[PDB]
Amino acid sequence: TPVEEAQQKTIEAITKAINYMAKRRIGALLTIERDTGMGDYIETGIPLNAKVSSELLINIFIPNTPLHDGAVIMKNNEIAAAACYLPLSESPFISKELGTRHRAAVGISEVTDSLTIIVSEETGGVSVAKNGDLHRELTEEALKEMLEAE
Amino acid sequence: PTPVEEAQQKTIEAITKAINYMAKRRIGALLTIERDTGMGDYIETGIPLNAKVSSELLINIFIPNTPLHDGAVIMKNNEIAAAACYLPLSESPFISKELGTRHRAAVGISEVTDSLTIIVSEETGGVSVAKNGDLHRELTEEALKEMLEAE
Ligand SMILES: CCOC(=O)N1Cc2ccncc2C1
Ligand SMILES: CCOC(=O)N1Cc2ccncc2C1
Numbered sequence: 023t024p025v026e027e028a029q030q031k032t033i034e035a036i037t038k039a040i041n042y043m044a045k046r047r048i049g050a051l052l053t054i055e056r057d058t059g060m061g062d063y064i065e066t067g068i069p070l071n072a073k074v075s076s077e078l079l080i081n082i083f084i085p086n087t088p089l090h091d092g093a094v095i096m097k098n099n100e101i102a103a104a105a106c107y108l109p110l111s112e113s114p115f116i117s118k119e120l121g122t123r124h125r126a127a128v129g130i131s132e133v134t135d136s137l138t139i140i141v142s143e144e145t146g147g148v149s150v151a152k153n154g155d156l157h158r159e160l161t162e163e164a165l166k167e168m169l170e171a172e
Numbered sequence: 173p174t175p176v177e178e179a180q181q182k183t184i185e186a187i188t189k190a191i192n193y194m195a196k197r198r199i200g201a202l203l204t205i206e207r208d209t210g211m212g213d214y215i216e217t218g219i220p221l222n223a224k225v226s227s228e229l230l231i232n233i234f235i236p237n238t239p240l241h242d243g244a245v246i247m248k249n250n251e252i253a254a255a256a257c258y259l260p261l262s263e264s265p266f267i268s269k270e271l272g273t274r275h276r277a278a279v280g281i282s283e284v285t286d287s288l289t290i291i292v293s294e295e296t297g298g299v300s301v302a303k304n305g306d307l308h309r310e311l312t313e314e315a316l317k318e319m320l321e322a323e
């Protein structure tokens with residue numbers, strides 16, 4: 023159906039962007055809103071309300087640029103905003119070598135049903151935060167399975 | 173001012189802030205503002221954004237060596253319609269011979285539309301505008317803002 027085709031196109035755009043950023047160890051933080059509304063966090067960023075593309079997602083997270091610090095938040099198959107604030111988790115159970123992008127991802131996942139993707143700037147490792155837990159060192163197949171399950 | 177007028181002023185502020193930032197850093201840029209001649213055929217050659225304008229997004233689009241930096245950004249009113257768009261290259265003899273493809277594309281679209289195109293040179297940081305087949309070079313920040321306000 024059209025809705026299914028659109029969802030698959032968005033998953034493909036995300037995975038292509040994440041793969042590029044992982045290869046180059048470009049830090050990224052991408053939160054996908056689900057049933058819990060995230061308007062209060064969307065409002066802390068720069069409004070975009072843009073069509074998703076791999077190209078736009080890559081250009082947002084280039085280091086040393088206006089939009090690269092903070093989270094992209096996606097809603098209704100669009101990029102709602104970039105450079106958004108997310109709450110930092112205080113969980114003592116996050117790997118201690120991880121920094122603030124990952125604590126922000128876990129933090130938003132503790133108070134919403136959202137799915138957040140993180141690319142580490144240290145390793146290019148890809149992780150997902152959901153329900154207060156961080157799933158680390160994902161393969162491409164693993165991230166795609168999580169997006170489809172979501 | 174009406175909401176339409178306030179929105180126009182915000183869009184001008186966003187454009188001038190981005191152009192000034194790119195000029196300073198010698199970031200090449202090509203930014204076409206659609207007017208009354210519709211530019212759908214050219215918008216459709218790029219990557220669709222349909223995004224709200226911000227200075228931050230404009231700058232991020234043109235960072236060198238990134239997916240969106242080559243080709244034109246085409247704006248419709250208060251939105252960035254698409255990036256990395258193709259424009260026709262002018263063959264006008266009044267384009268300074270040292271200028272490259274971004275200036276030629278800008279003059280080219282300006283020959284077949286009433287659009288206003290801004291160009292930042294990656295070589296010099298100079299700011300120019302193409303309109304109605306003419307290129308106006310070495311604009312001050314003040315001159316660019318006035319041209320946009322009058323447009
Ligand atoms: C568009 C400008 O944005 C910023 O300078 N920050 C830094 C920053 C750091 C952590 N979370 C969000 C943000 C947004
Ligand atoms: C999104 C990818 O964009 C591109 O690779 N282009 C568009 C474009 C438009 C005009 N001249 C050169 C190029 C290269």
Ligand SMILES: [Mg+2]
Pocket residue numbers: 309310
């Ligand atoms: Mg002069």
